[PDB]
Short mmCIF file of C-alpha atoms and ligand atoms in Angstrom, two decimals:
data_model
loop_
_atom_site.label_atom_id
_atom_site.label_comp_id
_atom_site.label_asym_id
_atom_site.label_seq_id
_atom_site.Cartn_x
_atom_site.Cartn_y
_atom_site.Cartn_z
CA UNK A 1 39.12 39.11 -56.64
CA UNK A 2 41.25 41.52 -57.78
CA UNK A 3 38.62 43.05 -60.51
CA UNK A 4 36.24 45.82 -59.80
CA UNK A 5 32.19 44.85 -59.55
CA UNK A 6 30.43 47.47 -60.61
CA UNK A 7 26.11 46.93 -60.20
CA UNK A 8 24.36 44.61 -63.24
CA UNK A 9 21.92 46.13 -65.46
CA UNK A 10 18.82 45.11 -63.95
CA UNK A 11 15.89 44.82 -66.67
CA UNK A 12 12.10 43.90 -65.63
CA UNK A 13 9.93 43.23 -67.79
CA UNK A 14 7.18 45.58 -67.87
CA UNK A 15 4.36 43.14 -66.72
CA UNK A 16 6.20 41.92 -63.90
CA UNK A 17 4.82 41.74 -60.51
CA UNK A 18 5.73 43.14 -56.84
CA UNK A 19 6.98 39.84 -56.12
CA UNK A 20 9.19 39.38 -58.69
CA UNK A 21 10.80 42.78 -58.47
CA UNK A 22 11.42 42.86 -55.10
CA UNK A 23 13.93 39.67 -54.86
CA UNK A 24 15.40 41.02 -58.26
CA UNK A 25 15.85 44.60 -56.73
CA UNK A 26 17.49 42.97 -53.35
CA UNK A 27 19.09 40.09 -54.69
CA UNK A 28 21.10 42.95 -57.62
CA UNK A 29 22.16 44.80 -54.13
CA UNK A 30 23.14 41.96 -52.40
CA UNK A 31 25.30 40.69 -55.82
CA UNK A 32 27.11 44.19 -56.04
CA UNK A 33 28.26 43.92 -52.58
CA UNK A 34 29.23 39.98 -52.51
CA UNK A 35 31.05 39.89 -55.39
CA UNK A 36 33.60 42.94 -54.07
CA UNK A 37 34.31 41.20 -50.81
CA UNK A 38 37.73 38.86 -51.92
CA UNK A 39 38.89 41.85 -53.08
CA UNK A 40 38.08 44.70 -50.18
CA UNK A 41 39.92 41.80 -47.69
CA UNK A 42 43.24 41.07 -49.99
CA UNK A 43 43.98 44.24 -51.66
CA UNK A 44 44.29 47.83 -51.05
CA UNK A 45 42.22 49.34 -54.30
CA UNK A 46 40.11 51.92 -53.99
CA UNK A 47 37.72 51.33 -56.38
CA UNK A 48 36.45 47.80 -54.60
CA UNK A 49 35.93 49.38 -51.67
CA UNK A 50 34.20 52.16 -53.50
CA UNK A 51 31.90 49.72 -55.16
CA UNK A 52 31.08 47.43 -51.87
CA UNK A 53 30.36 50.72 -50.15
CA UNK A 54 28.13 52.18 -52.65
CA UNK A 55 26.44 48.09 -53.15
CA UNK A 56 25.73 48.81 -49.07
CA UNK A 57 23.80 52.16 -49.71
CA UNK A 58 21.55 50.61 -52.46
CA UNK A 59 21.11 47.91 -50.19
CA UNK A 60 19.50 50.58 -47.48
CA UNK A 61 17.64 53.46 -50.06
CA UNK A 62 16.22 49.25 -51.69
CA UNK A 63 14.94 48.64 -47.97
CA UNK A 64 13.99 52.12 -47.14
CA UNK A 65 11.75 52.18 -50.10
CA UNK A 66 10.14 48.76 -49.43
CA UNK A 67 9.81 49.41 -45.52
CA UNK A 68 5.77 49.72 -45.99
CA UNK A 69 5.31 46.79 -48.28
CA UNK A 70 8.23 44.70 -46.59
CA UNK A 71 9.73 45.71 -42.95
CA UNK A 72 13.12 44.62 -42.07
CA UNK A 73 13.74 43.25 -38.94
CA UNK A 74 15.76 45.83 -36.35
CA UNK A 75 18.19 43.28 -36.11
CA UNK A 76 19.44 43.20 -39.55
CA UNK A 77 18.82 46.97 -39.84
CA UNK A 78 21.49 47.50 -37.04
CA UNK A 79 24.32 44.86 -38.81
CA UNK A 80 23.66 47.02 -42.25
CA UNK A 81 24.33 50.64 -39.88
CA UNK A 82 27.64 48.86 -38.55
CA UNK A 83 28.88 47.35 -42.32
CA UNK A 84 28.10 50.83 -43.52
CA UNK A 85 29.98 52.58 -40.97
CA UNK A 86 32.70 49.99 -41.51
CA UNK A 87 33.16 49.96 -44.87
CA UNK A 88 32.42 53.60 -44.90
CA UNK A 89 35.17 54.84 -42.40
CA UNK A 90 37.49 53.27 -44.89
CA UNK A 91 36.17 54.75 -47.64
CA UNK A 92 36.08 58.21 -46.48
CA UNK A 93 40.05 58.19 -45.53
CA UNK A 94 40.69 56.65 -48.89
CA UNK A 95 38.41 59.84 -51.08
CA UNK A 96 41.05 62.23 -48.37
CA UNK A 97 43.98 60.87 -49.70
CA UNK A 98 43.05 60.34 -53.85
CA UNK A 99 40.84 63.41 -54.19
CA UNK A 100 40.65 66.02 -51.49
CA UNK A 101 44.68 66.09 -50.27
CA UNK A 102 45.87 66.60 -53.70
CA UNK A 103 43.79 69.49 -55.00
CA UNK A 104 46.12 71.42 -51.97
CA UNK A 105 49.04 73.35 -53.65
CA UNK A 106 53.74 74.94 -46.29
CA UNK A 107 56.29 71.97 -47.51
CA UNK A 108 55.09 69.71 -44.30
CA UNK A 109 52.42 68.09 -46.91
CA UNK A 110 54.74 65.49 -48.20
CA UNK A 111 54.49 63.70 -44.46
CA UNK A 112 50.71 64.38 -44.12
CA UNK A 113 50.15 62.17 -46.63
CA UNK A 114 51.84 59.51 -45.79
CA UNK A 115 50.17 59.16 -42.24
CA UNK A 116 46.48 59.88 -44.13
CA UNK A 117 47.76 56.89 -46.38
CA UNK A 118 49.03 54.84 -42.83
CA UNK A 119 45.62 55.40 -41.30
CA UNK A 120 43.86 54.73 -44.74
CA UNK A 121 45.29 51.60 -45.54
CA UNK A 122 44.72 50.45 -41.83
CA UNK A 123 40.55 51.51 -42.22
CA UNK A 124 40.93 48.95 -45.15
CA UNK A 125 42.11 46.39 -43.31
CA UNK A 126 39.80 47.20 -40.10
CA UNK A 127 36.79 46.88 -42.84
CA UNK A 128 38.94 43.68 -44.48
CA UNK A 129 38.30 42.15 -40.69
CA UNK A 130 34.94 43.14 -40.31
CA UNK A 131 34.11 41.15 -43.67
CA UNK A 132 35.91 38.25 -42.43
CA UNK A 133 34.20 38.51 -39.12
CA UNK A 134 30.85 35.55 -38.73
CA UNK A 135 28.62 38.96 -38.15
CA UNK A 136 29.16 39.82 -41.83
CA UNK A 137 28.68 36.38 -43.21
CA UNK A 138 25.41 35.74 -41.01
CA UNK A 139 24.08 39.15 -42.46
CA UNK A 140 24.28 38.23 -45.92
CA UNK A 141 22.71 34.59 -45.21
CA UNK A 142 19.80 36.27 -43.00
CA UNK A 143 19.12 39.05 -45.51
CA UNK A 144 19.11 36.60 -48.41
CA UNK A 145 16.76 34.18 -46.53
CA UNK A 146 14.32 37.16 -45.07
CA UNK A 147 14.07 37.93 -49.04
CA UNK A 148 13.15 35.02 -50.38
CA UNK A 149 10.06 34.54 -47.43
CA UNK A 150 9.13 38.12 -47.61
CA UNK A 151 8.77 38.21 -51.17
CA UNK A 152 5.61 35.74 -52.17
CA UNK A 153 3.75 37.88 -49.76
CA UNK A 154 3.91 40.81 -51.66
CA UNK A 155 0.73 42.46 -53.52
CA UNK A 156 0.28 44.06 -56.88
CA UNK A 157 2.28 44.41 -59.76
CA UNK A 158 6.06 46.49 -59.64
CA UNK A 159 4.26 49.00 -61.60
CA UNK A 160 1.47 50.40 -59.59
CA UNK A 161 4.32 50.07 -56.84
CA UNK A 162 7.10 51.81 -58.76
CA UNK A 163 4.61 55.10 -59.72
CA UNK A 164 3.81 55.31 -55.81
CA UNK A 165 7.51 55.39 -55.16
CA UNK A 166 8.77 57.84 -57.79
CA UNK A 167 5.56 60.00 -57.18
CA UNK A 168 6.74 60.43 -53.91
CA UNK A 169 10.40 60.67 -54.40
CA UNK A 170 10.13 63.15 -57.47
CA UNK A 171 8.01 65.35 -54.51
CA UNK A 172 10.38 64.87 -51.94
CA UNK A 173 13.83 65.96 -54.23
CA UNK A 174 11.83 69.04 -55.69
CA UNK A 175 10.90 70.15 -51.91
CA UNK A 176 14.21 69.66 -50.77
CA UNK A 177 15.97 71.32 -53.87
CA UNK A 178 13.47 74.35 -53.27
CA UNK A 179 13.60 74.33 -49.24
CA UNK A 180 17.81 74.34 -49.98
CA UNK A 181 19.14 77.54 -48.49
CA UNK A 182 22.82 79.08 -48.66
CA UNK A 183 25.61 77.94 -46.58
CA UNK A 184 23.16 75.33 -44.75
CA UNK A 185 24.51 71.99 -43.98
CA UNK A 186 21.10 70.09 -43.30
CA UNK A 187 19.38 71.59 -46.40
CA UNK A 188 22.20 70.44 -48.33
CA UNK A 189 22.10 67.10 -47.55
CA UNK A 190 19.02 66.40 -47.61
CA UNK A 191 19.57 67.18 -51.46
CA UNK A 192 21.91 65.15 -51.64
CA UNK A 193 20.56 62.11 -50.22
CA UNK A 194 16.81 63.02 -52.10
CA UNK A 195 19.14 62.70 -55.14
CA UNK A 196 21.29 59.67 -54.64
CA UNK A 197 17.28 57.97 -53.36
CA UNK A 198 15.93 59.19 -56.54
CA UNK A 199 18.93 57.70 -59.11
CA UNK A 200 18.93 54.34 -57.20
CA UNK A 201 14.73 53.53 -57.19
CA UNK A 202 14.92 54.67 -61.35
CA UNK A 203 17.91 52.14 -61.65
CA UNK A 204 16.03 49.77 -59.88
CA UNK A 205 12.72 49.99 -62.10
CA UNK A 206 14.88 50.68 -65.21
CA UNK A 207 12.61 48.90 -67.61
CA UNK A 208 9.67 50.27 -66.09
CA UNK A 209 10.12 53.30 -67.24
CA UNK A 210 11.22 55.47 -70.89
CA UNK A 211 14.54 54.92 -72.04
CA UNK A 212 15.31 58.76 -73.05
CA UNK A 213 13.27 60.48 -70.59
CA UNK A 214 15.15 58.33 -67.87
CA UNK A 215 18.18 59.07 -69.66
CA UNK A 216 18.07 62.78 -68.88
CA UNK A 217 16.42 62.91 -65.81
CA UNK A 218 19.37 60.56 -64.25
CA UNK A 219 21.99 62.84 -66.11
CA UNK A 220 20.48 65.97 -64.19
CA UNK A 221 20.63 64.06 -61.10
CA UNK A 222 23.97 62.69 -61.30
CA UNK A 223 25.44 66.73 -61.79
CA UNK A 224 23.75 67.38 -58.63
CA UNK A 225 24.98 64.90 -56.20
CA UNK A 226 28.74 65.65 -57.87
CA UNK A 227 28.53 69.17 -57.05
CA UNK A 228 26.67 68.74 -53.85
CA UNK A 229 29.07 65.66 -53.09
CA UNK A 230 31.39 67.78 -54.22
CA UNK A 231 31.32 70.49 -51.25
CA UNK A 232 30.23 67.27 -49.19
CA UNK A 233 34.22 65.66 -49.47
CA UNK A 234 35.75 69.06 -48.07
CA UNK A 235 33.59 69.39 -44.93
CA UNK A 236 34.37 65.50 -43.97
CA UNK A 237 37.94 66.08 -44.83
CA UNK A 238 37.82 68.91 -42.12
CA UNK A 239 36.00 66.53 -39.91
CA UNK A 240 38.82 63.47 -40.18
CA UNK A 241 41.95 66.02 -40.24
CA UNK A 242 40.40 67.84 -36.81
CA UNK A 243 40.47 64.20 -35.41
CA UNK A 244 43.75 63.08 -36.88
CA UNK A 245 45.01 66.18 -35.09
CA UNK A 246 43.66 65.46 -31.05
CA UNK A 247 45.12 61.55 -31.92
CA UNK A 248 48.76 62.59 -33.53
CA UNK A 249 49.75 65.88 -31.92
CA UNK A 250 53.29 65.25 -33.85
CA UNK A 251 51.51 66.26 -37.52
CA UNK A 252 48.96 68.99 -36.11
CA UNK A 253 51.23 71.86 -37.79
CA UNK A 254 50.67 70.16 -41.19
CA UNK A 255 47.00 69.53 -40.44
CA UNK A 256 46.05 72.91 -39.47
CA UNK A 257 47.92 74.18 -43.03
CA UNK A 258 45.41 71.67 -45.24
CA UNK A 259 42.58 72.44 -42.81
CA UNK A 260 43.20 76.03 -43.01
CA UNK A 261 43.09 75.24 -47.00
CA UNK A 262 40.23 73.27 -47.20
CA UNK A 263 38.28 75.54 -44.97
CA UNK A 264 38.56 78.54 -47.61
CA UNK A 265 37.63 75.79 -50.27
CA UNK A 266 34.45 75.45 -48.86
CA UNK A 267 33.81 79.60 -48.90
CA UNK A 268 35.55 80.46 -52.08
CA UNK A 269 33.86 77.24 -53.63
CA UNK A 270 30.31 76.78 -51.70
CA UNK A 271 27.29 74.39 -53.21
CA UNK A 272 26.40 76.35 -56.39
CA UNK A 273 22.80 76.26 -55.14
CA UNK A 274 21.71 78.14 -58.71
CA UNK A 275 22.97 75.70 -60.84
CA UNK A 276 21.06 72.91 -58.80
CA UNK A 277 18.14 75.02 -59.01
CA UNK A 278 18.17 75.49 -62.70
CA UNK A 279 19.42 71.96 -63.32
CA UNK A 280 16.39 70.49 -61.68
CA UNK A 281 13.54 73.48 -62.63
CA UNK A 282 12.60 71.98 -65.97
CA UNK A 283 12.70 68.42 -64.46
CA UNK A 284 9.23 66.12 -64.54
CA UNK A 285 8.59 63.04 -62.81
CA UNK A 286 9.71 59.84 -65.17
CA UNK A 287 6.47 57.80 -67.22
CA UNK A 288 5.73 54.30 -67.34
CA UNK A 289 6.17 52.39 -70.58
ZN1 LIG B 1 47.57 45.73 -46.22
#
């Protein structure tokens, strides 16, 4: 209520097991998006929201990570793809208004953005009835109680699991980085993604792992998915303005101006594809300590 919750340091001990980590890992996900939810239902800031939505994709890199070890059912899979899109419709009108409109510098603008903030404010409360809705609320019981049985059946220490996992991650971000080609939307975003997968999994295991190699490796990441991200927010602005148009014909003049705008952005300003590269050429795969 009314405060931010931003995701709690999670520290495992370096002996722990698979079993242990696993419930920690989940149950840290789980936190980040419970404790947002008074807040994403009574208010209107951006930064809950922001937080619940990015507690929700932790949530599904967490389970896409321990699919082999742990399987979730389809069921729950399918409420996680709908509080996602929920949560994430809202989120996406809400980055429109606070980041992409006012980069924009013809004088039909000023009424633009008050029916972006009309529509935006209405995703919030759409999302602040999903929340209140007994899907949500059976989600976070099922998931919680599929954790806790899943989790004594687990093998190995979080270790031998965690090198397996950032082997494999490490391989998959470099392949991506180096498959990337200019001015190609699935390349890009499969960056992106490999990026966001790889800064959630070291978070997760963050005492598994070297404090200052960590430290730079996450740093290298992070300017990666904000200029890939970056690029990313002027493409879905495109997307949501194109359908704001075909809904309210009224505004399409002053839609087609900041379309027109943001359009250009994304040629003038495109991916800078060669300082990913270089920012992740020198990068190795993170050590156990
Ligand atoms: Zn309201």
């Amino acid at each position: 209520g009314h405060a931010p919750f931003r995701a709690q340091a999670l520290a495992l001990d370096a002996d722990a097991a698979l079993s242990e980590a696993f419930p920690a890992i989940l149950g840290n996900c789980l936190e980040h998006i419970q404790r947002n939810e008074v807040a994403v239902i009574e208010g209107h800031d951006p930064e809950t929201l922001h937080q619940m939505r990015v507690g929700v994709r932790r949530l599904r890199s967490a389970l896409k990570l321990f699919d082999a070890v742990a399987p979730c059912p389809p069921a729950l899979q399918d409420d996680i793809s709908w509080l996602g899109t929920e949560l994430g419709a809202a989120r996406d009108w809400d980055v429109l208004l606070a980041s992409t409109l006012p980069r924009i510098d013809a004088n039909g603008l000023l009424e633009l953005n008050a029916l972006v903030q009309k529509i935006a404010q209405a995703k919030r409360h759409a999302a602040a009835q999903a929340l209140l809705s007994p899907r949500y609320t059976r989600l976070m019981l099922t998931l919680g109680a599929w954790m806790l049985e899943t989790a004594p059946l687990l093998d190995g220490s979080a270790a031998h699991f965690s090198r397996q996992i950032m082997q494999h991650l490490h391989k998959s971000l470099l392949k991506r980085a180096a498959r990337m080609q200019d001015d190609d939307a699935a390349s890009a975003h499969r960056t992106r993604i490999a990026t966001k997968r790889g800064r959630y999994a070291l978070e997760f295991f963050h005492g598994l792992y070297r404090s200052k190699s960590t430290r730079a490796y996450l740093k290298a990441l992070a300017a990666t998915q904000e200029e890939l991200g970056r690029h990313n927010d002027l493409v879905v602005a495109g997307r949501l303005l194109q359908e704001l148009a075909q809904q309210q014909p009224q505004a399409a003049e002053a839609v087609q101006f900041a379309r027109g705008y943001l359009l250009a952005q994304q040629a003038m300003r495109p991916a800078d594809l060669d300082a990913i590269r270089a920012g992740l050429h020198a990068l190795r795969a993170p050590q156990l300590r």
